[PDB]
C-alpha cells in the first residue's frame, strides 16, 4: 500500500508514504515544484532518490514545524529510511553519502545573566 | 491630548470662584483656562510660592501650570 517512514530535523517532522508510480511528489496537498520554489530545496528533498530510483515512485509528504531548510532536510531523512525498507541491499549506498543519520542539534537554551546562549555582556 | 468626548478639564470650584468674582489663590495647576477667566488675576501654586498670572485671551486653552514654573 504505502511504505511508511518519519524524519525529524530541528523542530520539523516529516512523514512519507512511498508508493509505486512516476515521480509526482506532493507535499501538504501541494506540488513539490510549488511548495519549495528554490532549486536547492528541491535538490535536498529529492537527493536520495537520484542517489540510487527516481521516476519510479509516487511520494506524498506531510510537513509541520520549522522553517524551509529544516523541513527540506527532515523530508530528505524520511525518504532515505523509506527506501531501505523497500530493499535491504540499499543501506550502504545511502549511509555512505550520509543520509540515514539524524542530526540531533537543536537551538540551545538561553542561560540567565547573558543576552544569548554563549554570548556574554561586555565587561570593559 | 484630552479626548473630545470628555470635553475640557476645568476645575469646578475655581470656575465658581471666578464666576462669583482681588487675586484668587489656587493649587489647580492642571486646570485648563476657560474664556470666562479672561481679565482675572490667578495666583498658581508652584511648590513653595504663588506665582500670579493675569489671564489674557491668548492664553485660553492652556493649562494653568504652564505659566508657573516649578524648577
Amino acid at each position: 500500500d504505502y511504505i511508511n517512514a518519519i524524519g525529524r530535523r530541528k523542530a520539523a517532522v516529516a512523514r512519507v508514504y512511498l508508493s509505486e508510480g512516476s515521480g509526482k511528489i506532493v507535499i501538504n496537498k501541494r506540488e513539490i515544484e510549488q511548495y519549495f520554489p528554490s532549486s536547492i530545496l528541491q535538490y535536498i528533498v529529492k537527493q536520495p532518490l537520484l542517489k540510487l530510483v527516481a521516476a519510479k515512485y509516487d511520494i506524498k509528504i506531510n510537513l509541520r514545524g520549522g522553517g524551509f531548510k529544516g523541513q527540506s532536510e527532515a523530508a530528505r531523512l524520511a525518504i532515505a529510511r523509506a527506501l531501505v525498507k523497500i530493499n535491504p541491499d540499499d543501506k550502504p549506498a545511502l549511509r555512505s553519502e550520509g543520509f540515514i543519520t539524524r542530526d540531533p542539534r537543536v537551538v540551545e537554551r538561553k542561560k540567565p545573566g547573558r543576552p544569548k546562549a554563549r554570548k556574554r555582556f561586555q565587561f570593559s | 491630548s484630552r479626548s473630545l468626548k470628555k470635553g475640557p478639564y476645568i476645575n469646578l470650584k475655581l470656575e465658581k470662584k471666578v464666576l462669583a468674582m482681588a487675586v484668587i489663590k489656587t493649587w489647580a495647576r492642571a486646570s485648563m483656562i476657560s474664556p470666562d477667566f479672561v481679565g482675572h488675576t490667578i495666583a498658581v501654586h508652584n511648590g513653595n510660592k504663588f506665582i500670579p498670572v493675569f489671564v489674557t485671551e491668548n492664553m485660553v486653552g492652556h493649562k494653568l501650570g504652564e505659566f508657573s514654573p516649578t524648577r
Binding site: 528554490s38 532549486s39 536547492i40 535538490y43 | -
Partner: protein
C-alpha cells in the same frame, strides 16, 4: 556539502566564505550572478574552470585554499563598483589575466 548547480564542494566553501549575516542563498545568488557575468563579459574554458584557474593564480593545501578564497573575496570587496557580483567578476577575469591589486598580495 554539495553545490546545488555544479555539485562541487569547493563552490559551497566559497559561498560559505562569501556569506554575510547568516544569509546563504544571497551569497549563492551573488556567486552565480558573478559566474554568469564572467561569461557574458570577456570570456576558452567554462566559467567553473576559469574560476578554478583564477583561484590557482591567486603549508597545508586546505589552508592555501582558504587563504586564497579569503584574499579573493577581500580584494573583490576592496575594488569599486555598484553590484557585488559585477565587482567580483572583475576579480575573476583579472586573476585569470594575472594582474591587478589582488595578485600576489
Amino acid at each position: 556539502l554539495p553545490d546545488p548547480v555544479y555539485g562541487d564542494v569547493r563552490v559551497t566553501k566559497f559561498v560559505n566564505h562569501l556569506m554575510y549575516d547568516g544569509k546563504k542563498n544571497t551569497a549563492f545568488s551573488i556567486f552565480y550572478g558573478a559566474l554568469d557575468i564572467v561569461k557574458t563579459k570577456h570570456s576558452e574554458k567554462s566559467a567553473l574552470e576559469i574560476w578554478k584557474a583564477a583561484l590557482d593564480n591567486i603549508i597545508r593545501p586546505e589552508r592555501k585554499e582558504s587563504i586564497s578564497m579569503k584574499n579573493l573575496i577581500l580584494y573583490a570587496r576592496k575594488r569599486g563598483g555598484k553590484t557585488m557580483a559585477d565587482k567580483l567578476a572583475a576579480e575573476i577575469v583579472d586573476a585569470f589575466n594575472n594582474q591587478g591589486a589582488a595578485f600576489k598580495r
